[PDB]
């Protein structure tokens, strides 16, 4: 069996797996009030991609396909292709096209289009609301709100690049996005299918450890916290190595590379998430000046040193 | 001594190291007419970063810092911080802040900003012309043209997210952007310093192999071809592995995973670029349905099988 290992990039050098932005810190705290069931950034330690997880760090929350204008509006329907411009088959055993956003919110970006007959191009500000009834990526159908009613052509390659998130209206601040609320991938009133399982700490005295970024804000007072279970580089590495899991739990160590100091301990679970010995109702934030180091296989009953 | 190896992800699954977009194909042809000296995606096989190359795949052509409004216009000057929000040190032996664009052109994107008191956010269309006289990233200053003259606060975290290239100089002309023309990093009428060296084929009967993407176009008729010398995932891998080079040339083989067939042979050079045995005046484009496999170190005298 090939020896298991973990990338030696520092957290500061790695990418969020749920939005194309760099990681900024670590986060642990109580998640009892939420169902922690993200679909992107899900991968087993022996290399099985789950949920809607694909391998490109920039193909996250991106959309590709062709667009159809909705008359009397500045809204466009995108008939979806897969992230590599293959036909999207709605019968594949996945919740949605790979890389589909896994949280409810209004994601702002740009719609770009190239006409293949002469290489003419255009770009427009666009917003997609993954909570709207017409958000149905599992059916191959997504609606975008743009600033034009005419400039986009049918049957031409179109790409959505995400930039950030917005909050609107006179409602409470940071009410939106809701990073732990999965969208209805098939539209209003449908059940999601083939989901990566929800995760929660099991051994008592432990809590989940999150790899956290801050989504750029484009308008309003949004909740820009975005926690992921594995860095996108870890997803790429486990898939490549596919090292057999000698046990259910890999013991990792957080090491500052300049001092060599060990700063805390944690458990990497075979199904692809991390728990630490952190307790209580407050949150603990950890600067990103460290890398993870695999030291030995253990079981779920190993007792971690509180961090 | 650690054995050398290259990631096993197919080209389709890897990211361009000169812009945050996926790789789409391989490209080889005569390039003696150009000076091939990109500063991003520059890394030796034992993991020494060169030029302005950093490790994040999403922090390429991004800028971070605070902005000062240029009165009487919709333009802003961004006083730069490093990509990790540290004070930029212009006395570092680098050509420009790590991740700076390494080509002359008009790059379109969005400027987002967060006010640290109340968490209010804002985003605006923005273009940076890397050929402009006030494009002086090495001095810590870059200028953006936006769509506002008021809605940006001073001394607040501001980020530029790139989306694509535009084109409004020679209109239908495919004369811009110019991917093999370095900016004047210190501004108009200055000379660049600490460049990663230019590359060219040395062995008779050989040409450079490029990892090619197509940049999104946002306006006009831009030249969207973008060739990098190494996938950003290879830069990441070499930096972590840091395996000693037993020879100046690693022999790789391009293999289609679905079949196991070798499609061609190539030399990976210690300094961080690839050459193949190909010598027409015609270009050759290769679909990205294959990965690279390190087979053995060889000398510069090795004769590759033609393609």
């Amino acid at each position, epitope marked *: 069996t090939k020896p298991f290992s973990v990338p030696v990039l520092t957290v500061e050098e790695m990418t969020n797996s749920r939005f194309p932005i760099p990681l900024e810190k670590l986060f642990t705290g109580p998640s009892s009030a939420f169902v922690v069931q993200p679909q992107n950034g899900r991968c087993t330690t022996d290399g099985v991609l789950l949920g809607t997880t694909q391998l490109s760090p920039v193909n996250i929350c991106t959309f590709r396909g062709d667009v159809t204008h909705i008359t009397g509006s500045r809204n466009y329907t995108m008939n979806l292709a897969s992230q590599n411009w293959n036909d999207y088959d709605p019968t594949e055993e996945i919740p949605a096209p790979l890389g589909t956003p896994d949280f409810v919110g209004k994601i702002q970006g740009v719609l770009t289009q190239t006409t293949r007959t002469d290489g003419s191009t255009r770009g427009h500000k666009a917003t997609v609301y993954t909570g709207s009834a017409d958000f149905a990526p599992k059916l191959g159908r997504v609606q975008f709100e743009t600033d034009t009613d005419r400039d986009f052509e049918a049957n031409q390659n179109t790409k959505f690049t995400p930039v950030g998130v917005i909050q609107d209206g006179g409602t409470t601040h940071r009410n939106e996005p809701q990073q732990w609320v999965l969208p209805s991938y098939s539209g209003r009133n449908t059940h999601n299918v083939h989901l990566a399982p929800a995760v929660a700490p099991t051994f008592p005295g432990e809590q989940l450890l999150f790899f956290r970024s801050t989504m750029p804000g484009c308008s309003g007072y949004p909740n820009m916290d975005l926690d992921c279970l594995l860095p996108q580089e870890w997803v790429q590495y486990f898939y490549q190595e596919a090292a057999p899991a000698q046990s259910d739990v890999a013991l990792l160590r957080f090491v500052n590379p300049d001092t060599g100091r060990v700063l805390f301990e944690c458990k990497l679970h075979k199904s692809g998430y991390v728990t630490v010995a952190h307790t209580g109702q407050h949150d603990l934030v950890i600067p990103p000046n460290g890398y993870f180091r695999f030291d030995s296989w253990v079981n779920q009953f190993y007792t971690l040193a509180p961090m | 001594t650690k054995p050398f190896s290259v990631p096993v992800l197919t080209v389709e699954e890897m990211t361009n190291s000169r812009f945050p977009i996926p790789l789409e194909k391989l490209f080889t042809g005569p390039s003696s007419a150009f000076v091939v000296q990109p500063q991003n995606g520059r890394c030796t096989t034992d993991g020494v970063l060169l030029g302005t190359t950093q490790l994040s795949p999403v922090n390429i052509c991004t800028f971070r810092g605070d902005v000062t409004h240029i009165t009487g216009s919709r333009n802003y000057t961004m006083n730069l911080a490093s990509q990790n929000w540290n004070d930029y040190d212009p006395t570092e032996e680098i050509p420009a802040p790590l991740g700076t664009p390494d080509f002359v052109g008009k790059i379109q994107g969005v400027l987002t900003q967060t006010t640290r*008191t109340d968490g209010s956010t804002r985003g605006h269309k923005a273009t940076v012309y890397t050929g402009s006289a006030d494009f002086a990233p090495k001095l810590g200053r870059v200028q953006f043209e936006t769509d506002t003259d008021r809605d940006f606060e001073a001394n607040q975290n501001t980020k530029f997210t790139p989306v694509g290239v535009i084109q409004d100089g020679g209109t239908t002309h495919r004369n811009e952007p110019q991917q093999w023309v370095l900016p004047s990093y210190s501004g108009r009428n200055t000379h660049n310093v600490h460049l990663a060296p230019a590359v060219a084929p040395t062995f008779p009967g050989e040409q450079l192999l490029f990892f090619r993407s197509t940049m999104p176009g946002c306006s006009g008729y831009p030249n969207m071809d973008l060739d990098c010398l190494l996938p950003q995932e290879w830069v990441q891998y070499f930096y972590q592995e840091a395996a000693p080079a037993q020879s100046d040339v690693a022999l790789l083989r391009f293999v289609n995973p679905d079949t196991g067939r070798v499609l061609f042979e190539c030399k990976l050079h210690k300094s961080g670029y690839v050459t193949v045995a190909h010598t027409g005046q015609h270009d050759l484009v290769i679909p990205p349905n294959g990965y690279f496999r390190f087979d053995s170190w060889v000398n510069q005298f090795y004769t590759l099988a033609p393609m």
Partner: nanobody
Amino acid sequence: QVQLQESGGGLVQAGGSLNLACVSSGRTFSTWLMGWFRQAPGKEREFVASIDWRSSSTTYADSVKGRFTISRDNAKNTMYLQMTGLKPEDTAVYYCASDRDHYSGTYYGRRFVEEYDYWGQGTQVTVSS
């Protein structure tokens, strides 16, 4: 989960010296960037000094450079501020603060108050002309 307690400092004549200390307690993490701030009645809180967890990078306000010295002892969970040449201008409450998001002593926003996430109740320094 975090309490910063600063001590030392009281009444000193113009020209004198003081030694402030700040002790960390609770669910803390050793890499947090930390600094000193001061606020006088009816005025705005202003930056004084900062230092990283490795004592690599020290930063001082222009109005205290040369006179003040920031120092950090992680094993004792204590930050220090040695003050000399005290003028009545330096009369204020002195607070120690800590930014859980950052570790670099060159973090470009290290002088902004709103970047720090944990604050002590402060110790009073009064310099008498």
